[PDB]
Amino acid sequence: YCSDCGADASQVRGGYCTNCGASADRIR
Numbered sequence: 833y834c835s836d837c838g839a840d841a842s843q844v845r846g847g848y849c850t851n852c853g854a855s856a857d858r859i860r
Contacts, residue, residue, distance in 0.1 A: 833859070834851065834854055834858055834859055834860075835854075835858050835860050836854040836858045837852040839851040839852070844856060844859055
């Protein structure tokens, strides 16, 4: 999941969370 917004990890592309724009390293 994204620690910044809670989106599921499957929503990350191109190095960012596609919902809130967090950098990839915010995924846990």
